[PDB]
Write a protein that binds this DNA or RNA. Structure first.
Ligand SMILES: [Zn+2]
Lengths: 394, 124, 288, 190, 114, 126
RNA sequence: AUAUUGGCGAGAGACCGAUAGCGAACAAGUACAGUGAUGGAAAGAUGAAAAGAACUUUGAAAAGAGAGUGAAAAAGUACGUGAAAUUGUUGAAAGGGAAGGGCAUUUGAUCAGACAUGGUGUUUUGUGCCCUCUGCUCCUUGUGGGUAGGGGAAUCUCGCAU
RNA sequence: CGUGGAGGUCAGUGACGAAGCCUAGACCGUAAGGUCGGGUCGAACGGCCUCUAGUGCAGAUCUUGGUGGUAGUAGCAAAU
RNA sequence: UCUAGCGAAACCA
């Protein structure tokens, strides 16, 4: 297994070559074959988001608003294996706008001040040879980055959204042939909104907005802080004329799993208190219980049935949760081994779980058996990991 | 403070309890080496153990033998802890009764020896 | 075997008696043989080693590992600047009693540029943080008292610095100390002990930042924070550099015990580390 | 039968009835308006009955008729009360028209109490909570005390202080003839 | 109202200090310097069973018992039973402050951490 | 409940039966349930454990461990599995006396008596 | 068909819970006493697991002290829990051949002593069971109960938030 | 008013600590007594309506056990 | 005759 870890405390990446069963916490256990620091740029500019294009290049998100294309090589470690060496080829800068964020710092739930981050780094198109990628800020700035034919990153557009955008998910299910580019986004009292952008990437159109539920048991307004989202297949049966054909699910801050059928309408037809006392939730991943890969490359759950949906989330404490489509807890994941708030989790290939957070520990978990596969100390706070191909050296 | 303090404990000690209480009250609050030299003078009948409650000053040998055995034990424990010998004075001592039969009156002797403190002259 | 009470007690006590007889004779015979030869004494003590818990701790890679980006993080999340002294803010919790006021008065003399407030009802922590930022306080200290006893401490570095919640267990005043000593205006030196884990180095850099730098060498005063078994001990002392090469001490001000309960990113935002009793049951990790 | 049922409930075992230290009695009957178990109070002893009672958010007037003495599943009739306090008291007086003074009076009282409880709960939900309650297990407390004692006795911290002070001194870190150390003693080190 | 107590002290047996085997409960003997219990010391019927807070106490085991004091808040005061576990005591306290009932013994088996 | 008169429900009789049991009855008492896989293999839930077979631990402080049984300590109603030991401060090793109700058998050691027992209990033995 | 404080077995108890219950829950008709006939005790609880304290050291030896196991030695084969009588040390006070309490008050020491922090009216804006339109559903069929979709607060109005 | 046991009930309490013990801690009872805090502790126990009794102790030179002073005294096979 | 060691019982609002 090869891993690339965005290491915050160094402001770098680390390449990890380790086999199944590697545990750094025990001397008797398997030790990792190779640990490689790369591209250390200080804590002010740590890696936010990485996009691997198949092998030879990766895409980096700075905290300085800079998006970087990096050439990836392999060279022999001098049990034999190649290690990887990194070379930045192109960079596009100046994509953050903290002025609205310090402007909105009064109406803010968190106690710390607000700074911009690249929340979304992904292609716009499910088809390959896209060379047209998106970069989403917390400031609502959506940037259209083109890989040039001279192999140079060039920005095409910089469009605005509403203020704080905690998350932005693209819809990649069906009809890649048609030029229809659907995404959703939301944030602190910023409703989940479906927006189509034009395929010429010069204009967007907000096509849908959610609506809030009625008042609670205490007749209070329910606070709106959605945290994450994925898409499903649209509604089967008869479409209702002029509603929309979209079905998708989301995780709020206040422990609500919220399901959305646009055929039903703008209000949640289903909202679930997952945890007592409205515990904060951080990320949201979707998975098959048997480790199967049932999602898109952007992770959208390729089914129509909300009851088939199974999710994994994290709080701001040390907890990793599993839930069904109804909110019943399928279990806790590696609860006895983590000690930190898992900042980052990810379902890799259906059957592996990337974990890394404040614990300074990279944890490959099994999806199906719920067993820890690999534990690695890295010496840095973790916010993002990509997993390369499985290698099984010796 | 447990750090600058050693301890010695004796249990079930088949001695006359009343005589041991007197000779333990005689030794309290003394420097360790001076108290041991005093106990040596007791064995030569040079200086006697004064009797206050259970009574004039005798020389009860069997009590003093076990007492200085515990004093050697506490000194060895202090040196294993690595304390000063000259600062080391007995601070606490207590005798109480052991159970009667397993008519005799045995006892539990214990003592705590402590380094004498020395203060620091303040600067400016 | 035997289940009668008085038979079994007697038999096992006599077995103990014969055993301790034999052990005394054997150590005395070894003592005679090591009177003769000082080699096999050394061969015994090299042969068998007295196991202690300090000897046997679960291996951690955080021990003796360098911190990545330690200087930028050290200026970032900590106030580590000789140019900028810290504004320290004392935040004694709502409806405080007299005991926490006395402990705050103690803590005045420890910390530099320290400022006290009496909290009032209805001020949220974001509002307080905003006001302390506008007044350029760089860290706030919250005393949590309960039942007229100071039980908890909270440390927050203000420019989005990390939150620390320590549990104070045992506290001794100055007057209950026998070797009393009188502290002076002189800035003490500082001692940090056994902070070698990565979280321990984080906490050590925390206390290194919060405590005043630049000690007064004239007034021979020192403070100390010892770490043992996830129990840190605060004391403070006066120097006697003896001719006999052992420095002499007098425990000047108050002593207490702290234990980190919670280490959180930011101003109560996300928790890096917590304490649990299920962590305590393993009894050999000692998360420092 | 109501007075027979009442004297059974009174002179023998009312399962809901709770006995105070004062001597006063208290029904745990969920429909009972007053807390008490008295002749007017037990809903079991009376067939005409009414009660302000809240289901999750909304407050409902619950009516009990002698007409439905049988069929206790279909027993209670429910009326949604208005959020206007005045209008809901008017609704109470409407549905309790030609009705006795006790049920209307105590029913208005219970309505006011429940609405003010709603107000205080909204307040406490909005109220900031720094401290949270922790009960401490005695097992945990004893481990804390004894292990702090074992750590303090184990670590002879004073000797290690003397060690690190000699380490800082011999390492340097004080210059030539420091103000800490006497000059003769420092020359003995030198 | 103004609570009269009629007897501050306690009523002890004659010669109760003179022997350790003799208890301190009132037992009738079968000088006059010993206060003897009698019905004249019985307190006023309005003032009887009143705390110094001015309430009548009421033992509460769980939340359903606490809800029985919903209407009589100013008259009574809830007291948590001695054997309630600490998980339930915080729930009882939150529910009681929601109901606005004075708890006689808060902070029993409980501490406030952070 | 108890329908036969010849069955008794006295606690004192039941404990006196339990603690004074002969060893042939004890191996019937010392029984462990099979795995879901072994139930899918043979169609049978629980079996008298012996020492030659292989097991996993599903409760206790040593939960999620496994091994071959070293020896069945029938006198203490207990069973020493190999490699689940406490290592003393001398360095020597002593196994945890496990209890077969807290164990799940993973790999059976099949014998002719064992195969015939599976057959008489209705097993679909391969 | 009847009796059955014995034998061989069962099954029960509004029985006693280790000074009780058989003398005997335990190596009890035992130890022991009597020449004998006979009489006849006391004595239950480490822990979940002995994991029963490796090793160093004092120590004739008994016992220690470091150390460690254990969730707990505030469980160390003197062992669940561990009352009183009584003993030792320290602290405080009093006494000088002083005895105790009752009342009442000082002094000294000491403890308790809000998770209290709201209500009323007005105003700003926002939101929803508020308004409007379009539904669905349960019967106790009414002075009902639940529930959906879209729109609006541009105006009114209620509740909520502000 | 209190105690052992029994029927019903509180979907009573309880390993986040029952019962018991201590409590120069508070409260309610005229009292018999009851309630809570704290400490210790480790596995069961209470309130209410009834039933039932081997059901309430300071003495009986009561029974059994434990511990005093006498007293380091008498005295040295007083048991060894 | 003294020391040391061992060490009672009678009786006891
Ligand atoms: Zn009633």
């Amino acid at each position: 297994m090869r891993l690339l870890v965005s290491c915050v405390d160094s402001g770098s990446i680390k390449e990890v070559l380790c086999n199944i069963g590697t545990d750094t916490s025990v001397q008797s256990a398997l030790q990792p074959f190779h640990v490689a620091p790369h591209l250390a740029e200080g804590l002010k500019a740590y890696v936010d988001r990485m996009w691997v294009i198949s092998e030879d290049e990766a895409i980096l998100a700075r905290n300085s608003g800079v998006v970087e294309l990096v050439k990836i090589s392999k060279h022999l470690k001098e049990p034999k294996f190649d290690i990887s060496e990194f070379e930045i080829t192109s960079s596009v800068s100046d994509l953050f706008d903290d002025a609205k964020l310090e402007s909105l710092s009064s109406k803010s739930v968190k106690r710390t001040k607000l700074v911009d981050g690249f929340v979304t780094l992904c292609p716009i198109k499910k088809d390959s040879s896209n060379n047209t990628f998106v970069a989403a800020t917390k400031s609502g700035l959506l940037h259209i980055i083109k890989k040039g034919e001279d192999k140079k990153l060039i920005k095409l557009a910089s469009l605005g959204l509403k203020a704080p955008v905690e998350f932005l998910q693209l819809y990649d299910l069906e009809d890649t042939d048609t030029d229809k580019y659907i995404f959703a986004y939301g944030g602190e009292e910023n409703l989940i909104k479906l927006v189509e952008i034009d395929s010429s990437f010069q204009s967007l159109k907000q096509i849908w907005e959610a609506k809030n539920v009625k008042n609670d048991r205490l007749d209070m307004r329910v606070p709106v802080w959605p945290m994450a989202l994925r898409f499903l297949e649209p509604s089967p049966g008869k479409t209702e004329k002029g509603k929309l054909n979209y079905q998708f699910a989301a995780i709020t801050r206040w422990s609500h799993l919220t399901k959305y059928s646009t055929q039903h309408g703008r209000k949640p037809f289903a909202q679930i208190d997952l945890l007592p006392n409205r515990e904060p939730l951080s990320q949201m991943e979707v998975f098959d219980a048997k480790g199967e890969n049932v999602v898109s490359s952007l992770g959208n759950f390729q089914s129509e049935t909300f009851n088939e949906l199974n999710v994994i989330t994290t709080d701001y404490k040390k907890n990793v949760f599993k839930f069904d489509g109804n909110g019943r807890m399928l279990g806790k994941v590696g609860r006895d081994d983590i000690t930190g708030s898992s900042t980052y989790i990810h379902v890799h290939d259906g059957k592996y779980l990337l974990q890394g957070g404040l614990d300074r520990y990279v944890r490959i978990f099994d999806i199906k058996t719920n067993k820890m596969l690999v534990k690695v100390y890295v010496g840095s706070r973790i916010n993002f990991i990509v997993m390369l191909d499985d290698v099984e050296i010796e | 403070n447990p750090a600058k303090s050693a301890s010695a404990r004796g249990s079930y000690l088949r001695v006359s309890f009343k005589n041991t209480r007197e000779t333990a009250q005689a030794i309290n609050g003394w420097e360790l080496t001076k108290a041991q030299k005093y106990l040596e003078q007791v064995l030569d009948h040079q200086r006697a153990i004064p009797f206050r409650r259970f009574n004039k000053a005798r020389w009860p040998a069997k009590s003093v033998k076990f007492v200085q055995g515990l004093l050697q034990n506490a000194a060895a424990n202090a040196e294993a802890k690595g304390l000063d010998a000259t600062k080391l004075y007995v601070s606490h001592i207590q005798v109480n009764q052991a159970p009667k039969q397993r008519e005799s009156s045995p006892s539990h002797i214990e003592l705590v020896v402590t380094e004498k403190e020395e203060a620091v002259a303040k600067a400016a | 075997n035997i289940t009668n009470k008085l038979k079994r007690q007697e038999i096992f006590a006599d077995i103990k008696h014969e055993k301790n007889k034999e052990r005394h004779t054997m150590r005395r015979k070894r003592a005679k043989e090591e009177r003769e030869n000082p080699e096999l004494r050394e061969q015994r003590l090299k042969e068998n080693v007295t196991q202690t818990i300090e000897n046997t701790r679960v291996y951690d890679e955080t021990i003796n590992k360098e911190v990545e980006g330690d200087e930028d993080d050290l200026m970032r999340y900590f106030n580590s600047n000789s140019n900028e002294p810290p504004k320290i803010f004392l935040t004694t919790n709502v409806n405080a009693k007299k005991s926490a006021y006395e402990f705050a008065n103690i803590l005045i003399e420890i910390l530099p540029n320290v400022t006290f407030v009496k909290r009032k009802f209805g001020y949220k922590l974001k509002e307080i943080s905003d006001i302390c930022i506008k007044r350029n306080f760089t860290d706030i200290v919250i005393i949590n008292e309960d039942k007229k006893k100071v039980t908890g401490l909270t440390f927050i570095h203000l420019p989005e610095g990390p939150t620390f919640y320590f549990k104070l267990s045992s506290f001794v005043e100055v007057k209950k100390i026998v070797g009393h000593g009188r502290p002076t205006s002189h800035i003490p030196e500082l001692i940090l002990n056994n902070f070698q884990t990565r979280l321990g180095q984080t906490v050590g850099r925390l206390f290194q930042s919060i405590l005043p730098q630049n000690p007064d060498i004239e007034g021979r005063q020192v403070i100390t924070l010892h770490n043992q078994r996830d129990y840190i001990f605060f004391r403070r002392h006066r120097y006697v550099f003896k001719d006999n090469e052992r420095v002499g001490l007098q425990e000047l001000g108050p002593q207490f015990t702290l234990k980190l309960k919670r280490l959180q990113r930011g101003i109560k935002e996300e928790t890096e580390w917590e304490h649990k009793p299920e962590m305590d049951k393993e009894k050999k990790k000692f998360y420092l | 039968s109501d007075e027979i049922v009442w004297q059974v409930i009174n002179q023998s075992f009312c399962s809901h009835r709770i006995k105070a230290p004062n001597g006063q009695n208290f029904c745990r009957n969920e429909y009972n308006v007053t807390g008490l178990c008295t002749r007017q109070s037990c809903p079991l002893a009376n067939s005409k009955y009414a009660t302000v009672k809240c289901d999750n958010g909304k407050l409902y007037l619950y009516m009990k008729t002698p007409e439905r003495a049988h069929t206790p599943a279909k027993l209670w009739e429910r009326i949604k009360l208005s959020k206007n306090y005045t209008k809901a008291l008017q609704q109470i007086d409407e549905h309790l028209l030609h009705w006795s003074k006790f049920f209307r009076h105590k029913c208005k009282q219970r309505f006011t109490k429940l609405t003010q409880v709603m107000i205080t709960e909204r307040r406490l939900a909005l109220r900031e909570e720094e401290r949270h309650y922790v009960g401490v297990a005695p097992k945990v407390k004893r481990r804390e005390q004894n292990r702090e004692r074992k750590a303090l006795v184990a670590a002879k911290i004073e000797k290690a202080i003397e060690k690190e002070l000699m380490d800082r001194l011999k390492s340097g870190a004080y210059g030539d003839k420091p103000l800490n150390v006497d000059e003769k003693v420092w020359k003995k080190i030198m | 109202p103004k609570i009269v107590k009629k007897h501050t002290k306690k009523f002890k047996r004659h010669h109760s200090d003179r022997y350790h085997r003799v208890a301190e409960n009132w037992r009738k003997q079968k000088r006059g310097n010993i206060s003897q219990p009698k019905i004249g010391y019985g307190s006023n019927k309005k003032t009887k069973f009143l705390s110094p807070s001015g309430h009548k106490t009421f033992l509460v085991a769980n939340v359903k018992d606490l809800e029985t004091l919903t209407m009589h808040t100013k008259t009574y005061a809830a007291e948590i039973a001695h054997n309630i576990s600490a998980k339930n005591r915080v729930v009882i306290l939150a529910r009681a402050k929601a109901l606005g009932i004075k708890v006689t013994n808060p902070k029993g088996r409980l501490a406030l951490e952070a | 409940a108890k329908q036969s008169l010849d069955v008794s429900s006295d606690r004192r009789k039941a404990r006196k039966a339990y603690f004074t049991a002969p060893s042939s009855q004890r191996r019937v008492l010392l029984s462990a349930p099979l795995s879901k896989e072994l139930r899918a293999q043979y169609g049978i839930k629980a079996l008298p454990i012996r020492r030659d077979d292989e097991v996993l631990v599903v409760r206790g402080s040593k939960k999620g461990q496994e091994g071959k049984i070293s020896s069945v300590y029938r006198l203490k109603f207990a069973v020493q599995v190999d490699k689940v030991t406490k290592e003393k401060v001398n360095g020597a090793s002593v196994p945890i006396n496990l209890h077969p109700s807290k164990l799940v058998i993973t790999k059976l050691h099949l014998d002719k008596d064992r195969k015939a027992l599976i057959q008489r209990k209705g097993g679909k033995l391969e």
